[PDB]
Amino acid sequence: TRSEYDRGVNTFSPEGRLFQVEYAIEAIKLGSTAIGIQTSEGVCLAVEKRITSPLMEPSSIEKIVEIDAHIGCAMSGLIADAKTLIDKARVETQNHWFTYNETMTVESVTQAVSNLALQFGEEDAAMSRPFGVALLFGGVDEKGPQLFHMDPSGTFVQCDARAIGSASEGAQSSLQEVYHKSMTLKEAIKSSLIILKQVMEEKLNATNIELATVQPGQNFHMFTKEELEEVIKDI
Amino acid sequence: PIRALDEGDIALLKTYGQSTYSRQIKQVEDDIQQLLKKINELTGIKESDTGLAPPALWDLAADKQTLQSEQPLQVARCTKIINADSEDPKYIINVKQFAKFVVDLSDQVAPTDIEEGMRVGVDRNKYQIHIPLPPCKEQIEKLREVVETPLLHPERFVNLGIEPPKGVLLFGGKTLCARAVANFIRVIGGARMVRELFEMARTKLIFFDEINEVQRTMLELINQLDVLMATNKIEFSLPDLEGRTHIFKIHARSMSVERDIRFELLARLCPNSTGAEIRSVCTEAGMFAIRARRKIATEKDFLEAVNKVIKYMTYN
Amino acid sequence: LDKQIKEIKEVIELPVKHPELFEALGIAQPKGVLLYGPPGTGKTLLARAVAHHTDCTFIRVSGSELVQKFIGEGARMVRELFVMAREHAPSIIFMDEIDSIGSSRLEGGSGGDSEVQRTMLELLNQLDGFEATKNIKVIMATNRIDILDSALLRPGRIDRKIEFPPPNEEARLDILKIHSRKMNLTRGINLRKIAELMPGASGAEVKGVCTEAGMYALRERRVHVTQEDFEMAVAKVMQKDSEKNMSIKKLWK
Amino acid sequence: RYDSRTTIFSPEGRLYQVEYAMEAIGHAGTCLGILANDGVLLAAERRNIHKLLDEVFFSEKIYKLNEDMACSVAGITSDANVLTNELRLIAQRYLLQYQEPIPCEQLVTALCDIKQAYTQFGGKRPFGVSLLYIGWDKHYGFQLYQSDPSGNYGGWKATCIGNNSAAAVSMLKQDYKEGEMTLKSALALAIKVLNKTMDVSKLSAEKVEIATLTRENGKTVIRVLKQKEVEQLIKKHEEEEAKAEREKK
Amino acid sequence: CGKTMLAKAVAHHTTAAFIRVVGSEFVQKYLGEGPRMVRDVFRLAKENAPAIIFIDEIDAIATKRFDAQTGADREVQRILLELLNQMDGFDQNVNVKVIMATNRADTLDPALLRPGRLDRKIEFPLPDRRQKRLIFSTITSKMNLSEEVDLEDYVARPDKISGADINSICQESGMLAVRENRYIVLAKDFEKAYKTVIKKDEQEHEFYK
Amino acid sequence: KGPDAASKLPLVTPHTQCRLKLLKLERIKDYLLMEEEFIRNQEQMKEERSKVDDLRGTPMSVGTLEEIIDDNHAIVSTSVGSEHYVSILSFVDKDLLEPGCSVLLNHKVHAVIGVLMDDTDPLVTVMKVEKAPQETYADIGGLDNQIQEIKESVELPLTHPEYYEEMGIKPPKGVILYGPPGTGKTLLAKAVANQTSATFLRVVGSELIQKYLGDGPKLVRELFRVAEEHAPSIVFIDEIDAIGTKRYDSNSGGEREIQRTMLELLNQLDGFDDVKVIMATNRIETLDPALIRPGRIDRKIEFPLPDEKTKKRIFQIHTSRMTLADDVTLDDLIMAKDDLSGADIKAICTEAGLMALRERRMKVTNEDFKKSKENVLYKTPEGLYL
Amino acid sequence: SYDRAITVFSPDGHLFQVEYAQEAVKKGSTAVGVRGRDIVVLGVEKKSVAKLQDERTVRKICALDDNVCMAFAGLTADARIVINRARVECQSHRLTVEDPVTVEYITRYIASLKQRYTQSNGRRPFGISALIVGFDFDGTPRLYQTDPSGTYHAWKANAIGRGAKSVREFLEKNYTDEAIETDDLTIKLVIKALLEVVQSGGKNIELAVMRRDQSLKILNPEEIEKYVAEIEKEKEENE
Numbered sequence A: 001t002r003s004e005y006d007r008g009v010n011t012f013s014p015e016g017r018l019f020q021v022e023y024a025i026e027a028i029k030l031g032s033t034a035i036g037i038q039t040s041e042g043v044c045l046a047v048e049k050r051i052t053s054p055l056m057e058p059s060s061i062e063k064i065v066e067i068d069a070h071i072g073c074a075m076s077g078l079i080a081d082a083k084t085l086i087d088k089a090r091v092e093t094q095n096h097w098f099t100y101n102e103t104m105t106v107e108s109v110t111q112a113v114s115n116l117a118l119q120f121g122e123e124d125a126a127m128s129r130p131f132g133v134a135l136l137f138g139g140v141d142e143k144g145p146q147l148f149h150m151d152p153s154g155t156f157v158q159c160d161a162r163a164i165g166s167a168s169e170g171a172q173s174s175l176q177e178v179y180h181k182s183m184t185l186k187e188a189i190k191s192s193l194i195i196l197k198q199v200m201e202e203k204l205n206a207t208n209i210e211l212a213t214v215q216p217g218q219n220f221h222m223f224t225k226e227e228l229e230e231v232i233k234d235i
Numbered sequence B: 001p002i003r004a005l006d007e008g009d010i011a012l013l014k015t016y017g018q019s020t021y022s023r024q025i026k027q028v029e030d031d032i033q034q035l036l037k038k039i040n041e042l043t044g045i046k047e048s049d050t051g052l053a054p055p056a057l058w059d060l061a062a063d064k065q066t067l068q069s070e071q072p073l074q075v076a077r078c079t080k081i082i083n084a085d086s087e088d089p090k091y092i093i094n095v096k097q098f099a100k101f102v103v104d105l106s107d108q109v110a111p112t113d114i115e116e117g118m119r120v121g122v123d124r125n126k127y128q129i130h131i132p133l134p135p136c137k138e139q140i141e142k143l144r145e146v147v148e149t150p151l152l153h154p155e156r157f158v159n160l161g162i163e164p165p166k167g168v169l170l171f172g173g174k175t176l177c178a179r180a181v182a183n184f185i186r187v188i189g190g191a192r193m194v195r196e197l198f199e200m201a202r203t204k205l206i207f208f209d210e211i212n213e214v215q216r217t218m219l220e221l222i223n224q225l226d227v228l229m230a231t232n233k234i235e236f237s238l239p240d241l242e243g244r245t246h247i248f249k250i251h252a253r254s255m256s257v258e259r260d261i262r263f264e265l266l267a268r269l270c271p272n273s274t275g276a277e278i279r280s281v282c283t284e285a286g287m288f289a290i291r292a293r294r295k296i297a298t299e300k301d302f303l304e305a306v307n308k309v310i311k312y313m314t315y316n
Numbered sequence C: 001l002d003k004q005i006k007e008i009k010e011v012i013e014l015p016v017k018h019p020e021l022f023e024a025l026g027i028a029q030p031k032g033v034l035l036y037g038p039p040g041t042g043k044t045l046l047a048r049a050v051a052h053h054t055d056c057t058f059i060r061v062s063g064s065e066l067v068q069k070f071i072g073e074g075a076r077m078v079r080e081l082f083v084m085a086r087e088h089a090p091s092i093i094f095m096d097e098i099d100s101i102g103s104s105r106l107e108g109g110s111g112g113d114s115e116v117q118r119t120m121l122e123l124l125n126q127l128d129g130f131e132a133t134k135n136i137k138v139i140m141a142t143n144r145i146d147i148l149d150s151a152l153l154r155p156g157r158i159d160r161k162i163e164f165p166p167p168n169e170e171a172r173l174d175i176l177k178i179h180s181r182k183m184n185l186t187r188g189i190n191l192r193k194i195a196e197l198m199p200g201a202s203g204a205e206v207k208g209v210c211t212e213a214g215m216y217a218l219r220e221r222r223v224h225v226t227q228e229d230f231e232m233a234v235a236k237v238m239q240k241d242s243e244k245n246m247s248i249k250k251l252w253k
Numbered sequence D: 001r002y003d004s005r006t007t008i009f010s011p012e013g014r015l016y017q018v019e020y021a022m023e024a025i026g027h028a029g030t031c032l033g034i035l036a037n038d039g040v041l042l043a044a045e046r047r048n049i050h051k052l053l054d055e056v057f058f059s060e061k062i063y064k065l066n067e068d069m070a071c072s073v074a075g076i077t078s079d080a081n082v083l084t085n086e087l088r089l090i091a092q093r094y095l096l097q098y099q100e101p102i103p104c105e106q107l108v109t110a111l112c113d114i115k116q117a118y119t120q121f122g123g124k125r126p127f128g129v130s131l132l133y134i135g136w137d138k139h140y141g142f143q144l145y146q147s148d149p150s151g152n153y154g155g156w157k158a159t160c161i162g163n164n165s166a167a168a169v170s171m172l173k174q175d176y177k178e179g180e181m182t183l184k185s186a187l188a189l190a191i192k193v194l195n196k197t198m199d200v201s202k203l204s205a206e207k208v209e210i211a212t213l214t215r216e217n218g219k220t221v222i223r224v225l226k227q228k229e230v231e232q233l234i235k236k237h238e239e240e241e242a243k244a245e246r247e248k249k
Numbered sequence E: 001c002g003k004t005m006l007a008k009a010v011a012h013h014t015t016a017a018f019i020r021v022v023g024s025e026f027v028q029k030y031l032g033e034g035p036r037m038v039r040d041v042f043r044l045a046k047e048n049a050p051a052i053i054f055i056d057e058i059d060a061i062a063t064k065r066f067d068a069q070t071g072a073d074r075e076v077q078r079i080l081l082e083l084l085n086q087m088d089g090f091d092q093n094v095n096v097k098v099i100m101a102t103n104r105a106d107t108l109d110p111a112l113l114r115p116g117r118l119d120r121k122i123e124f125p126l127p128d129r130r131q132k133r134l135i136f137s138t139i140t141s142k143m144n145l146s147e148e149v150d151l152e153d154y155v156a157r158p159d160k161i162s163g164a165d166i167n168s169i170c171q172e173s174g175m176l177a178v179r180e181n182r183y184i185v186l187a188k189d190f191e192k193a194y195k196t197v198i199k200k201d202e203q204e205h206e207f208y209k
Numbered sequence F: 001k002g003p004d005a006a007s008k009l010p011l012v013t014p015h016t017q018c019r020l021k022l023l024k025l026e027r028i029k030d031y032l033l034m035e036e037e038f039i040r041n042q043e044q045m046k047e048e049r050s051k052v053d054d055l056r057g058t059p060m061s062v063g064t065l066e067e068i069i070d071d072n073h074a075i076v077s078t079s080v081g082s083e084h085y086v087s088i089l090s091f092v093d094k095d096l097l098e099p100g101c102s103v104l105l106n107h108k109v110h111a112v113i114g115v116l117m118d119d120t121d122p123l124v125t126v127m128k129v130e131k132a133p134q135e136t137y138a139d140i141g142g143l144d145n146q147i148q149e150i151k152e153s154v155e156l157p158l159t160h161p162e163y164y165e166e167m168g169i170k171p172p173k174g175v176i177l178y179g180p181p182g183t184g185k186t187l188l189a190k191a192v193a194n195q196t197s198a199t200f201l202r203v204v205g206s207e208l209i210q211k212y213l214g215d216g217p218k219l220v221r222e223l224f225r226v227a228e229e230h231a232p233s234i235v236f237i238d239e240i241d242a243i244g245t246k247r248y249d250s251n252s253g254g255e256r257e258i259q260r261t262m263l264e265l266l267n268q269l270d271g272f273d274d275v276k277v278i279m280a281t282n283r284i285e286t287l288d289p290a291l292i293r294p295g296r297i298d299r300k301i302e303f304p305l306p307d308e309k310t311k312k313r314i315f316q317i318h319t320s321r322m323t324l325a326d327d328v329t330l331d332d333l334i335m336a337k338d339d340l341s342g343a344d345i346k347a348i349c350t351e352a353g354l355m356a357l358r359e360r361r362m363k364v365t366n367e368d369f370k371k372s373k374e375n376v377l378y379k380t381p382e383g384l385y386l
Numbered sequence G: 001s002y003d004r005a006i007t008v009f010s011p012d013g014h015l016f017q018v019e020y021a022q023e024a025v026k027k028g029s030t031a032v033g034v035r036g037r038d039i040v041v042l043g044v045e046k047k048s049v050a051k052l053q054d055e056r057t058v059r060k061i062c063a064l065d066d067n068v069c070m071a072f073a074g075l076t077a078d079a080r081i082v083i084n085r086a087r088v089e090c091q092s093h094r095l096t097v098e099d100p101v102t103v104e105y106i107t108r109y110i111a112s113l114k115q116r117y118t119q120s121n122g123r124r125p126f127g128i129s130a131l132i133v134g135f136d137f138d139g140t141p142r143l144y145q146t147d148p149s150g151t152y153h154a155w156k157a158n159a160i161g162r163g164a165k166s167v168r169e170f171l172e173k174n175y176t177d178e179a180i181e182t183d184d185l186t187i188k189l190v191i192k193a194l195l196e197v198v199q200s201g202g203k204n205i206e207l208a209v210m211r212r213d214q215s216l217k218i219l220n221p222e223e224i225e226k227y228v229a230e231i232e233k234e235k236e237e238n239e
């Protein structure tokens, strides 16, 4: 019976559900897992890079990207939708800086990206299907470090610690167990890397992960091979 | 530009190109085959024993006596007694693959206690019969709440004024889930069989598996009852991540596996699979370890089995 | 049909007559040959000629003789036939209109010919399974080959596939000579010109041309035949029903 | 069923509507072209020769696209007319912009881009016409190209499209000399292959039209051979055939 | 157009045996029964004597042999193939002449149209003016007729009247006369019958013209 | 009663016509003469039971025992559908009669007088393997993996049945070889029958279905019964898609009987104890999921078309016996990216040899191979992809 | 019925028709690309043509600019359209900003084009895969690969088309810094990797070479013959 109520994004099922939106939410899973953690010292993003074969130089699997000098976006889903939404986020941050001569709040930028993702089939904007990608915006603003999760349905919500991607269900419980409100950035990094090792196919070693941090201070930083090895030494 | 072979051409083809021992080789090979056939012919049948009992156990006296007078009888299931007409019962018989007849039987104790609807031995010529022939999630939580509680203390239902009913449909690991719920009435996936099941049941939660012989079975069953059907109101489907991990652990306990196995990771890698599929994955991991010639199966072997059994750059 | 005749003669005669050649070559003997082509090209006629000029036991299955109503009888009949061929080896099994017994299989449902499909599977097994056939050659014939099950077309079950294209006007002249040899012709007659007047005509059409020319001769209580009668017979036999709206015809420039 | 639209990919990755158009080109009247160092030529059969039709147009399949270029169409009549007019427009647009005739490769590229756009965009059926272009330009002298319904073009020494294209191309491969063919030999070969491919009694001079493009005095000339010249060529070919038959006898 | 009647003619002018069968008779519910019936018919005709098998209505079985992607149509195709194979196969027949009639010769299989199996392909067109005159004479015979009748008008009036409907014209003119209490039919009686047989359909949505 | 195996003579290693092979064959023939002479010589060298026979019916019949009763009475099927409440003589073994056994009955009185344990349906007896195909694993080019899995499924569980026990893993008792039309599916079964010590049993799905009443299910019963009586055994069912297609509600009686036989087969696939089953199939989707359920068909071996290396190996295997010419080069034929089965390669080699013979030359050549490849294969538009 | 629509999702979350476009790509002649220290090379299989067919009208290697080349695998018409638009945008970017296009920029633009064509419902995806090899304005042997789904990655050496998997595995095994130390070992590696699919080695091979601050050069058939002779000599010597 679920074959006539999901031919279009603008068709309601008897349960009053947007099955196409639900289907895109399901599509979210295919991507590699990402974990973001908020702490009073900042926010940390760690993503399981999923190199399908070596000889692929790592600077093309962009699961963590930079939004302005104060936010980082972790992606899970279609690379095309990832690129489109990342471009929108960057353009919106720069436009807000140009207009109001300030730095957009993480909540505001996530809201703008969600506003772009809202337009499903509205004949007034031209995408026609949900953006099969889930994003984690971790940044620093006047309200202290913050982290937000946005899903294809345009819904965004604050999250002091969240995980998305293929290892979403298995990592959410680990985050719940290991999370106490007060940590340090190093503690969050260690916990996130431990969870990644728990829910990663490969042995966690130097490459195959990416780690980024935004702190009330130095701008968004991508940990290089040296720091990655240093942390992996005593995860 | 195509020619036809000549007799001299083919003779030259046969002789010219050949090692000097070709003819002898063919002769010896034909000899081999013919002699093998001759040996097969001359085998000599090994006398097929008739099943005769060891000597000194035969009597031949009871044998002669039974041969002289044992009156072999044919087997047939009675269908009706035509109400027995009080006297002159006039039973009806359905000699299988042969015919249906009517009979008075006689020589037995009581026209009614003889038989009603079950096997009987009809005499050869006069069809008078002589002898009465003898013959895990809410998917389990709900079933628990509807069976086990009205197993040790069903009287609570009557205490509260509710009638505790029977009859639950296990539509959907159905078999072993039902067995665990029992932890017994085994059933096979006709009217005589269900009648027999009625007799066994009524001298004591009947686990029907796969649920006009069959129509008569349904009629008698419905009349008797007013039970666990196993079609394939509680529903059964695949388990979630934690259920798959639990099944993996349950089935990998009995293996020479390595110390630590990421069963959570394997459950994540194995979606939409069944319990039988999980069993197959574990067994394939075992054969993979054996192929590798290593006594201890590892996570690598388990992952290889997952890939082989259950089963790209646009999603990272 | 010189090339086809000699190819089929290879496949059947050469293995049955002189297996030593294949033994020396070190190649397994050919087993089956499938004759396919448009109607009236000479498939069944060549089968008859082989049966007449072959000294091997010639068995013939024609049409859907193996499609028996009783359950599990076609397979039994096929097995018995192959047993009989083995008994009277060397054997040549002609099999006309295989697409009757055996075509592209279907998803077995309420609307599937499961019995015929399984009989065809039995035929497959007999042609190539365990205990491969010793001296049982098979000459299957069909009109449309594309629908035949790929299992049948598998080389080993059909070691050769002979096409029977319509004559190239030279085969047409030869067929006219063959079928008019017993015809009281008249001087000043050009069977060659008749052949050219017949384009793309099958051998059956040529035989019909001869028959209709004879019929026209009979019409005038005659024993003659002439270019007029032959031309009229060609026109009558090749009565092509074309399309005359000219718009459906000129849609394609 | 992966063939209800021109913009649908079958699970194997096949454009079934495009393939249907390519196959359906097989119904078009036979056309063929041969390249020679002296010049280039096309021959084409008239599918319908009913005696109640006029010869108002001195060409039915061969059109002149510009001063230095001609093309033969094979396919649906409406699409053929549309593409012919559009080719004329493209060539004259290039002439207006650059003040020099468009190279044949460039014209083929433009029209094939348009064909591909039709195969790719929305609810438009692919242009179901194949084309054979002949032209001259200062960059590659004489050229002959062949364009398919799917917007794919290739440069050929000699080729054939339409009815009996397989037989015609087989004969062209067998008989065509790679680099020592003159215009007369090309015409003889064209008549021979047309005779062996039409399979309609004798090759009547009225059931065929031939065009020849050659450079003369620095100016290209495309001549549509008259009935007299076609009659002469067919008569010469049948004389050669009779000589061969007599010698074989 | 009077083809079944021509078959009835043979059978009242043939010294040979006759076997009339219906194209739909060969079909059967059980697998293989259709082919068995075809083989039985042909073998019986071959063995008895010079015989004529009149398979009327052949289009019930012989239609173009498409893939058929099912069971029943494949059984029909097997009936057709058995018919082809018996008419011209390995075991050639002799003196088993066959006649078959159909209302639509286009759909028939191209293999059961091959000189050697169907080498005549006779057409039975709708009557021309001359055939209309002959039919009218033959029918109006054995019939009392008025002196004022002009069959020429009816014959000349261009229509699509077939032999069966010409017979119907004469028959209903006869019944109209009987009801009118008269054994000699008048021109009014025919005119009525001719109108009631032509049955010219009207009300055609006129924009089509 | 143990396995039955298949008698097979040793294999002469040299495939060339040489004195090694000649002497090996001569020794084989010497030993065959010895066997024949020993037989001849031995068979030349060589009351109470009489009354037992006299009491036993002269033309005694064979029936089936059912629901043994008492110690002297039992129900027996006459083998025509009917059954009788017969008696048992003291002659029979007793403590040996079980339901389904093929007992012997006095013709007239119909009294049990024998047991006839070796009663085998002629169909089962004939489908049992006696000879052994001379296709060892060496003849199979490529399919190295498939050979590995088949050995692990039907060979290791017999030669080294300790690895499975060490880790408490039950062996797979069912292997379905599914693939396109001709890739070695039957070759692997041939090689297994050749090289195995187990009782092989050839069958084809189109053979188990008989017409009279329930003889289909009865024959399946007999087949698996003998496969159990002998052990280890390997039952090779070729083209199982004859019976096993998607089970559907029957509209007739024959279809109901077919589904009944298939169900009887599935039932007999729950009689573990060591009787391996090897299904073969050209199209596996049509098979019912119940059969392919992962509890009765444990392994599914796909037989894909051969790659370049596999095609090369096949070509050397099938040309080893051919007097190849030095000019030949066996790469162009292979790597031409076109479908080519192992059967297709054998056909190519045979047609090439025939072409050389037609040309009157006993040595094949490159042009002969090219012509063979052109004329053997029978069956995307140009330019559309580059 | 979860198919035959570019803008419809399936339970697994797939875009089946763009996946089908990738499958269509998989049916094209093999094209390998490699990057060296100062040389970037593209090899492509030819598949040969009938003698009656001219060759200059068949192209699998096309220069998108002075410092960027493009190898192709997929549908030829889509190839022509994509290459034309890529050249147009290269020149347009040169106009907009007075700096030659970077390989990353141009490959991103091509990926965006494919993404735009696969977003909507009335458009068919460009069923092609492309390899962009070039030298950035600072000097670097960059190589990217773009798929029909609008996704582009950066590689060091990759093969697309029919023999993609086998040739990629061979490059995986036999790609090393010493194997690309100089500007001839890279070419030798390219012919070695293509020989597992092509037959003649010289008659079914086309090579294009880009050297820093030097225009593209297509290797002559005689040069290819000499190179394949060198590889054959090396193989026999190592034997």
Ligand SMILES: Nc1ncnc2c1ncn2[C@@H]1O[C@H](COP(=O)(O)OP(=O)(O)OP(=O)(O)O)[C@@H](O)[C@H]1O
Binding pocket: B136, B173, B174, B175, B176, B177, B232, B247, B250, B251, B274, B275, B276, B279
């Ligand atoms: N919740 C569970 N707890 C324990 N074992 C389970 C569970 N779910 C599945 N299994 C495993 O599944 C198998 C039992 O399943 P069972 O044989 O009943 O099949 P099923 O899934 O009901 O299939 P079907 O009815 O379609 O044949 C055993 O391997 C058992 O270990």
Ligand SMILES: Nc1ncnc2c1ncn2[C@@H]1O[C@H](COP(=O)(O)OP(=O)(O)OP(=O)(O)O)[C@@H](O)[C@H]1O
Binding pocket: C001, C038, C039, C040, C041, C042, C043, C044, C045, C046, C143, C175, C178, C202, C203, C204, C207, E088, E089, E111, E114, E116
């Ligand atoms: N090459 C030929 N030489 C002579 N006569 C021929 C030839 N081909 C066909 N014929 C004539 O055609 C008649 C029918 O031929 P045949 O039945 O073998 O044709 P077919 O190709 O098998 O056709 P069908 O499709 O009807 O089975 C032959 O009896 C013979 O009269």
Ligand SMILES: Nc1ncnc2c1ncn2[C@@H]1O[C@H](COP(=O)(O)OP(=O)(O)OP(=O)(O)O)[C@@H](O)[C@H]1O
Binding pocket: E001, E002, E003, E004, E005, E006, E103, E135, E138, E163, E164, E165, E167
């Ligand atoms: N030529 C004719 N001469 C005289 N009466 C004719 C003629 N044709 C048809 N009829 C009349 O029409 C009746 C039906 O003719 P007949 O059954 O032979 O036609 P048909 O074309 O075979 O019809 P059908 O297609 O319905 O089988 C004949 O009994 C006769 O009454």
Ligand SMILES: Nc1ncnc2c1ncn2[C@@H]1O[C@H](COP(=O)(O)OP(=O)(O)OP(=O)(O)O)[C@@H](O)[C@H]1O
Binding pocket: C124, C128, C129, C151, C154, C156, F139, F140, F141, F142, F143, F179, F180, F181, F182, F183, F184, F185, F186, F187, F188, F280, F281, F282, F314, F317, F341, F342, F343, F344, F346
């Ligand atoms: N791998 C192989 N090695 C050697 N010969 C092979 C191979 N594969 C196929 N053959 C040849 O093909 C035949 C073996 O194929 P086989 O009968 O096993 O195929 P199959 O899968 O059962 O076919 P089908 O589906 O058509 O019944 C023999 O001729 C053998 O020579």
